[PDB]
From a paper:
Sirtuins are NAD+-dependent protein lysine deacylases that sense the cellular nutrient status, regulate energy metabolism and stress responses, and have been implicated in aging processes and aging-related diseases. Sirtuins feature differing substrate acyl selectivities. Here, we analyse modulation of [name] and other isoforms by quercetin and its derivatives in activity and binding assays and through crystal structure analyses of modulator complexes of [name] and Sirt2. Our results hence reveal sites and mechanisms for Sirtuin modulation by quercetin derivatives and provide helpful insights for [name] modulator development.
Catechin gallate (CG) is the most potent quercetin derivative reported to inhibit rather than activate [name]-dependent deacetylation (IC50 2.5 ± 0.1 μM). Testing CG in our MS assay confirmed the surprising inhibitory effect of this closely quercetin-related compound, albeit with slightly lower potency (IC50 80 ± 15 μM). To rationalize the inhibitory effect, we determined a crystal structure of a [name]/CG complex at 2.0 Å resolution. The inhibitor does not overlap with the binding pocket for acetyl substrate but the catechol group assumes a position partly overlapping with the NAM moiety of the NAD+ cosubstrate. Testing CG inhibition at different NAD+ concentrations did not result in significant changes of residual activity, however, indicating that the inhibition is not based on NAD+ competition. The inhibitor CG differs from activators in a slight rotation of the catechol moiety, and more drastically in a tilted position of the chroman and the presence of its additional bulky substituent, orienting them toward N-terminus and Val154, respectively.
Numbering used by the authors:
A (entry chain A): 10 to 169, 177 to 298
B (entry chain B): 15 to 169, 177 to 298
């Protein structure tokens, strides 16, 4: 743990100039329109505009540690609002333009945004989730459960069981949830488009999943302020704030970014809603 | 640049719950409420403060850089920003005094005739000739009340200039006069995310205490005037303010993107009041 390699921390950030940024987001529009099966891969960079620090950015948790300083939080995990990027992905799933959502974030804000749990894989677990040791039953709480490392929380199952409730937060040596990884594996492989937002792609197998989309001819788009493990394999790379990227994208798609009325859990995706007709391309 | 990077205080859960109940009680019994904001109400949208552990001046002093997790154009009003829209709309807020240049008060749709922008607005340029101001969709590009290179279109062709005060620059006499009036004639002054080290900006809440007004200070770090507070809350303003709106029975209204409202609209209905003693 103390020993855990935290990979490359504190790389310099890149900024596309505004004419390049505009042209890259249009091209992204073009790929979303042409693409039958779009998967989104997300990471700690999509939550930074809500006051939760990343791991490996300039003021990341691992970065600050390495220079002997502390990360800073501007909210509690309970008071934290889903970002524009979060709500734009809610909408893209509602209108049937997102097929699946693969996240490394434990920050719980995908679930709180309202995003359907049967189209999300939480590869690293969820700070608001506990799970019965005995029956595998998961409980989505309004407050952080209080333990990390798949340890006992101090509450007992109430299904009719009384099994031991435990946190979902993996430690360094912990095998990824096999249900969430298999679903994420299948959705990455059958994707013809994988878009990574605010991940540096350094954690295996999480950060390799987008690469499975490039077999039998899929396209990869990396959106990221810093470099990432896989920039070499990207058809498009956008250096820019995820919220600026995703609001320009929704505007190109003619969709609005939906309201957030506070924490909610949806188990199962609702039937698809209307979406605008497509531009002619070529 | 004053005291930069003092350590943070955190009220424990029961004390925090009891302080916000009591703020609720002060809001119910108060005739004329003013809100005094600073850079701390925007940190949960990825704009750093000036004097916090990772504030701009604080990081300068340590020869490190501040971090923006957004652009000023992409920044979204926080829960705090929208709760203050709602409290003005139901008539519980008399006036808003802000030290912020971030331009989000206005973008939140808060009415300009009830706001004082003590330190200017990065989206605002002002004709030197006819004093007409323009609220833009992008930051105007200059600081220090310098020429932006656009010209007036009032029929004037005058020189347009940024509104961002520098260190030696007097405060806008209109915004300071209404700020002072409002501070003097209040019975409750509430400060949110300001250290209160800048004068006169940070001295205004004190004018409420003369002829026996109350003052509430809500801040993570200490502040110049903790001594003159009738209540001090050591909490994230979003948590403080979401629980306050709950105690008053109000909703936090929806942001529909960047909008400018010049003049306050007519007051909307509010819940009736509790019994107090
Ligand atoms: N607003 C933003 N816009 C775009 N990029 C951003 C923004 N803010 C930050 N970033 C960038 O977004 C990227 C965030 O990458 P990392 O900090 O490694 O987080 P992970 O999700 O990849 O970490 C995976 C796991 O490792 C941990 O040990 C846990 O186990 C995590 O679950 C960086 O390059 C930032 O430049
Ligand atoms: N989520 C939060 N909740 C509560 N407090 C917070 C939060 N985040 C930060 N803070 C606190 O919020 C406080 C922020 O205070 P300062 O950083 O001095 O900003 P100012 O408005 O007073 O600066 C005045 C002028 O000086 C400048 O030069 C410009 O001219 C400004 O206009 C700190 O104590 C944090 O502890
Ligand atoms: O994981 C928990 O703590 C957070 C803060 C943190 C940290 O300060 C150091 C660190 O090594 C890990 C770490 O993980 C989280 C975090 C950090 C950064 C992010 O970007 C992000 O989204 C989330 C956690 C989990 C539970 O189940 C609990 O019940 C509980 O009380 C706390
Ligand atoms: O002010 C501008 O930049 C921000 C970063 C910054 C800084 O790095 C040093 C400093 O002295 C002032 C300063 O002011 C801003 C700021 C920072 C922190 C806050 O909390 C906050 O509300 C606002 C600004 C304004 C324009 O019109 C421009 O065209 C332009 O390029 C920049
Ligand atoms: Zn059980
Ligand atoms: Zn003019």
């Amino acid at each position: 743990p103390f020993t855990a390699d935290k990979g490359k921390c504190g790389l310099p950030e890149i900024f596309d100039p505004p004419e390049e940024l505009e042209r890259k987001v249009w091209e992204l529009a073009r790929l979303v329109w042409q693409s039958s099966s779009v998967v989104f891969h997300t990471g700690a960079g999509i939550s930074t505009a809500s006051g939760i620090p990343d791991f490996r950015g300039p003021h990341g948790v691992w970065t600050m540690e390495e220079r002997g300083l502390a990360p800073k939080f501007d909210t509690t995990f309970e008071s934290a609002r889903p970002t524009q990027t979060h709500m734009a992905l809610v909408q893209l799933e509602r209108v049937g333009l997102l097929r699946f959502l693969v996240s490394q974030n434990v920050d719980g804000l995908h679930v709180r945004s309202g995003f359907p749990r049967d189209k999300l894989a939480e590869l690293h677990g969820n700070m608001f989730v506990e799970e019965c040791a005995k029956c595998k039953t998961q409980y989505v709480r309004d407050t952080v459960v209080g333990t990390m490392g798949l340890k006992a929380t101090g509450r007992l199952c109430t299904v009719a069981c009384r099994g031991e409730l435990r946190d979902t937060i993996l430690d360094w040596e912990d095998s990824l949830p096999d249900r969430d990884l298999a679903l994420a594996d299948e959705a990455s492989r059958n994707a013809d488009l994988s878009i990574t937002l605010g991940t540096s792609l350094q954690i295996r197998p999480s950060g390799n999943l987008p690469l499975a989309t490039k077999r039998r001819g899929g396209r990869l788009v990396i959106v990221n302020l810093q470099p990432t493990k896989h920039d070499r394999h990207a058809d498009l790379r956008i250096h820019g704030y995820v919220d600026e990227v995703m609001t320009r994208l929704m505007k190109h798609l003619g969709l609005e970014i939906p309201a957030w009325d506070g924490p909610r859990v949806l188990e199962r995706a609702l039937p698809p809603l209307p979406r605008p007709p497509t531009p002619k391309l070529e």
